[PDB]
Amino acid sequence: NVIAAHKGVNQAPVPLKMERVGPHDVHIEMTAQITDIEIDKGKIYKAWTFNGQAPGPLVVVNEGDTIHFTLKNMDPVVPHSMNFHAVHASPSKDFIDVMPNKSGTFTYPANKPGVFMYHCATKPVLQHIANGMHGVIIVKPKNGYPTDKEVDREYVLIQNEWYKYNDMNDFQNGVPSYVVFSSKALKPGDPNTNGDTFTLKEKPLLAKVGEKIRLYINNVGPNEVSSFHVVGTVFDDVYLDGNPNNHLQGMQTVMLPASGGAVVEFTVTRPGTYPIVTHQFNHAQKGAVAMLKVTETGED
Template sequence: MKLIKENLLAFGLMAVTLVFGFAVLFFAATAGGGAEAAGGGEEPAGGGESASTLSVTLTEFAIEGSLTAPPGTVTIEAKNEGAVAHNLSVLGESKTPNFSGGESEVLTLENLAPGTYTVICDVPGHREAGMETELVITEDASASGETGDGGGNEPDYAAMDAAFTASILEFPAETEGKGNQILEPEILADGTKYFELTTEITDWETEPGRIVQAWTYNGQVPGPAIRIDVGDKVRVKVINKLPMGTDIHWHGIRTPNSEDGVAPITQTLIEAGTEYEYNFVAERPAIGMFHAHHAGQIQVPNGLFGTFQIGETPIPRGQTISGVTIPNDIEIAQEIPMVLNDAGVIGYSLNGKGFPATEPYVVTEGDWVVANYYNEGLQIHPMHLHQFPQLIIAKDGIPLDQPYWADTVNIAPGERYTVLINADTPGTWVWHCHILSHVEREDGVFGMLTAMIVQPA
């Protein structure tokens, strides 16, 4: 930890270069109704009820904009500036349909009485990830949503600078819980490797002080890592303590159809309070995942995912690729699993943690490192490691006949990439998703960012 803290100054200098691209979010408003009729001073039709128009912006995962208006009819213009579909719902009133990034929808609410109304995106997992705000109806508000405080919308850039620096210097922050812990099997009499996975909702600290109700395998996010060899007989017992049914799909793993984990097509649903067993033989090497298939849009973003590896991925020893020769005697110093998520209660995260609680990877100058990326999220994530090119040696666990170097590796939902990295330069090197809104917000750095710390040899 002392070494890591000594590297924080260098880390801050590198990561502060990420501070750009802020969008200043304004509300737009138009006033209508309540005006005197031309030439007569009579109230217009409708009895002079106020009509207000407000604007909000939806992103992953926030609802931004001023939502204060006088009683009466309120129209909310919502624009989706995110990468996935959202909606806008005023609980107890009405909601928009789902709409994609770049699209807009209008929600009109009539005869609103004074009070506070809860506004959410009710796409599963989005409210829990932060898409919740309030609509305040008050006699003190104007039809444009202003409350007469006279405040401007100019951001405080000095405060932003301070917030970014402070957030960076919190790294690495300690939190309770660690995912991806190796699950050791029980060896049965016939040699079968027996594993138990318990599904339940538990407290999970994604970043300092942010404790969520995660859907977990064995109380961790990602779930425990399963590592076996080609030819192994596998039995996995699932004990379901969730409030709903579940199943497990072995993503990227060859199994008999009956073991594919897609209820009710290949099996019966594992109902709440029941158990189920999967049995299959590991036929070939794989870099796979396991996750719920039933109600996957709820269960997976909220934490029900894990990694499953069969055998080893071949290293292209002795090959020369774009002028770089991989040593024949190469030794792998570390193998890093990096599971990406971006939704549900877990939110933007690497291995179930968001910055500054993400894990730094400490290596020695000259080390060769293998990283396996797994995307269990809903969005694409271009993963960029400063300084070091990444040699892509396998896609979805399938070794490439022609490996290639890439500065940034773009990983779509469900994909796995295996990369080889030569950490040949000492320093603290930032490692992050290069969609900047996945690592930055106005109060500082968060989410899908960590670092590789290379010690001098």
């Protein structure tokens, strides 16, 4: 399971590069790179990543934007690729491999609003996803969501699993060793974290008493479904996959398939710390608990 050319390799994170190039066109450049991430205290995973993050950096575009995407493969020996669930594309032409030390550019439209998974598409896809090559792209709906004016504060959360290192038998046949949440920044000052068992417990997300919170969520897997629940509240409104039409109300828990997304909104009525879980409690026990700290001011 050890790739000789990855020994000792720890490529420092590289910032996502994005720039708008027209009213409906956006350039995005990512890397594929090999980066050590502390997934549990004392446990380093030499992850296969986009940009040195796992899950990868957040991408946000508008409905109707065409994405001109470049992948720069920094892995010395493994090809990598990109599949955005947001886009309409030819997989065999547009989600193809970029060889080590090369770049590739691929263009495709994001026609549909929502909270989409992205991930590496190189065979075996399970191997590339499980080693860390997953993330979220949000496509903002042209006309918003009907409840936009009620939302006071918003964050992005992503659920993923971690297995035994680069172990295809475990990836296929074993239970996850860890299941984790991470948060990816939407506005300056938001946290930006990797999938680990501890950061969002020790540095909770912050909010203020009485606020309606929106979370953009996706369960990237690779393998498990998620029973997403915020303790001490009920979801006022849920939009499955973030499409405004798929509108549920008053859900205690949102069932997410592997790669499933949602926009969920809830009110926090009292000061305190509110756990955020997958209610599949074996997974929660193995790391998948984040915290939301609600104060009279909204500051820690």
